[PDB]
């Protein structure tokens, strides 16, 4: 399908348009096309090769340079030979199995996220009990000390200082080791999708082996080792153990790239967003500006899963855009086809499926989130952003817009910090929806020659990262203990070096303690706050 599309791409649109319709039909129904029957697969393949041998002779009727047509023709004959062959029939039964098993995997993902939600509910209950114990003990000690006091800030005395511990307590081994550590890190990232793929694969293998004659029961396979768990306490097929031993034998980089492919097949969505941004990043003025705004809006807001219908609209829009660019290129079409084929890759790997704005706005305020907060990465990405913009001063119009952008960026960072500290979420959503359209409208006035464009697009990309992390924070929603030093949690020498680094950058300690004394609810002075955070 890809080679056919690229044959339709690299030449002038005299008859290539038909092959875009092919990637309209072929990629839309590709799974169903494989899932139908040999008779109709060969019917439509014969139709396509007939239209190919039509269009070659039509391109002979003008009164070498047909190489893409020839190679795609060769591919069509090769696939036709495949599609006749009686060896593929069981691979087709494999895909019949993949048609059956989808709902069990959907229920398995549901059970896994229920397990996550109740593990975070239990963590929050334990932490609230711990904090209540702390406040109980503190109030009981302060009541004891005012008790033996009686027998407002500037009232301390030595009797407050009793020893009360009463209550509290040669080079190739290096290369192999580094690549094995990197593939171990990739295994650690893949582990959960790897387990899900493994259990589904084993179930599929068992069903297919059973499916020599017939298949009619689903719960009868659910007990061929109860309803809703994640367990693995069953038989052992020697074919699967043999495949596991074969893959186990490999230990070199082949396993590294295998785990890399398993990673990019596991997340799948992230590289979709990456390429959706990367098409706009290079040579896209206003065409791919209306798509990415709603990627943020629809995808990252409703629930962790992307919206049911966002993908279909995105793919149709991408195809419409590619066909519209035919008012008659080289890299532009190559990036719109790679974006399209990534969208369809993610849609196939998904394999599961004014009166309504307020609905999802309310569901954003139903409090089902795991309450994970990652501010330090917003602020780190914005600091790297400002370092890039200020180093970008290394015709004569873009610096004034870089410096007004610098001021808006400082204001935005301050406002985001203030928002993070009053624990409000709706303001962060409003800041999201304003800032995304503000920076995308600012993505007009870069150009009303190469370096400036590259640093400005790196800037855009890194604040796209900032917007994505902001939407992550919108999803998870502010755990009720956000007031602690960002870099202090464990007393390691690395941590000490990083803290002494953080107090070395100019104007970053006093700004932290001033924005903390202004927006946090406290009853001290400014000097009192400064004294406390320096003693700390």
């Amino acid at each position: 399908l890809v080679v056919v599309f690229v044959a339709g791409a690299t030449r002038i649109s005299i008859f290539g348009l038909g092959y875009l319709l092919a990637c309209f039909y072929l990629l839309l129904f590709g799974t169903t096309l494989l899932q139908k029957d040999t008779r109709a697969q060969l019917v439509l393949w014969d139709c396509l090769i007939l239209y190919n041998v039509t269009v070659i002779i039509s391109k002979n009727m003008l009164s070498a340079g047909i190489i893409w047509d020839s190679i795609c023709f060769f591919f069509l004959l090769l696939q036709r030979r495949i599609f006749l062959s009686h060896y593929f029939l069981h691979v087709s039964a494999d895909l019949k199995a993949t048609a059956l098993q989808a709902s069990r995997g959907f229920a398995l993902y549901n059970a896994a996220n229920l397990k996550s939600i109740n593990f975070h509910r239990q963590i929050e209950e334990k932490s609230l009990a711990q904090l209540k114990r702390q406040m109980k003990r503190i109030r009981a000690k302060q009541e004891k000390y005012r008790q033996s006091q009686a027998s407002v800030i500037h009232s301390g005395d030595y009797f407050l200082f009793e020893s009360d511990s009463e209550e509290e307590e040669f080079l190739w081994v290096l290369g192999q080791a580094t690549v094995d550590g990197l593939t171990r890190w990739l295994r650690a990232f893949t582990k959960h999708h790897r387990t899900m793929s493994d259990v589904l694969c084993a179930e599929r293998y068992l069903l297919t082996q059973e499916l020599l004659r017939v298949g009619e029961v689903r719960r009868g396979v659910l007990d061929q080792l109860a309803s809703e768990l994640l367990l693995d306490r069953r038989l052992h097929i020697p074919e699967l153990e043999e495949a596991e031993r074969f893959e186990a034998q490999q230990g070199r980089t082949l396993r590294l790239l295998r785990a890399g492919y398993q990673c990019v097949a596991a997340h799948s969505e992230l590289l979709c967003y990456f390429i959706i941004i990367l098409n706009h990043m290079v040579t896209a003025s206003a065409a791919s500006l209306v798509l990415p705004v709603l990627v943020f809006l629809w995808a990252m807001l409703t629930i962790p899963r992307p919206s049911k219908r966002f993908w279909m609209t995105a793919i149709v829009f991408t195809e419409v855009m590619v066909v519209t660019k035919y008012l008659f290129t080289d890299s532009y079409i190559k990036y719109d086809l790679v974006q399209l084929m990534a969208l369809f890759f993610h849609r196939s790997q998904l394999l599961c499926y004014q009166p309504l704005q307020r609905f999802f706005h309310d569901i954003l305020h139903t409090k089902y989130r795991a309450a994970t907060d990652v501010y330090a990465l917003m602020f780190l990405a914005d600091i790297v952003d400002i370092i890039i913009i200020i180093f970008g001063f290394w015709d004569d119009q873009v610096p004034q817009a870089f410096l007004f952008m610098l001021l808006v960026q400082f204001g935005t960072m301050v406002i985001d910090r203030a928002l993070y500290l009053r624990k409000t979420v709706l303001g962060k959503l409003a800041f999201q929806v304003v800032l995304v359209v503000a920076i995308h409208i600012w993505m007009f006035f870069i150009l009303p020659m190469f370096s400036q464009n590259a640093v400005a697009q790196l800037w855009y990309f890194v604040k796209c990262i900032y917007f994505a992390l902001s939407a992550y924070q919108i999803r998870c929603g502010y755990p009720t203990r956000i007031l602690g030093n960002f870099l202090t949690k464990k007393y390691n020498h690395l941590n000490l070096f990083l803290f002494q680094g953080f107090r070395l950058v100019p104007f970053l300690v006093e700004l932290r303690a001033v924005m903390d004394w202004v927006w946090t609810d406290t009853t001290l002075s400014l000097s009192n706050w400064m004294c406390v955070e320096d003693i700390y």
């Binding site: 001063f393 290394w394 100019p506 104007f507 006093e510 000097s527 004294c531 320096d534």
Partner: protein
């Protein structure tokens, strides 16, 4: 080719940001002089009641105006001793009722 009206730039592209980063660094390590070092002088800075020192200092001014020098340098003696020992400041700067 157009002619710059003043050509006052006075420096090349590389080697001017150094001046700006020097200025920001010096101002920074000025402004962390007294907004993130007020820990050592907390004792002198905060006293709940100062009346028994302020009376001593008004008497130092008085004897300084009467010319009875030896009570000038023995109230200065009491002042230096009071400040030198922090412990005797807490025994001496309470309030009354």
């Amino acid at each position: 080719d157009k002619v710059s009206p003043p050509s006052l730039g006075f420096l090349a592209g590389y080697g001017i940001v150094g001046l700006y980063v020097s200025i920001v660094l010096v101002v920074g390590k000025f402004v962390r002089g007294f907004f993130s070092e007020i820990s050592h002088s907390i004792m002198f800075e905060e006293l709940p009641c100062v009346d028994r020192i302020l009376k001593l200092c008004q008497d130092i001014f008085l004897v300084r105006e009467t010319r009875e020098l030896e009570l000038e340098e023995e109230l200065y003696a009491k002042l230096i001793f009071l400040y030198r020992s922090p412990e005797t400041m807490i025994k001496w700067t309470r309030e009354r009722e």
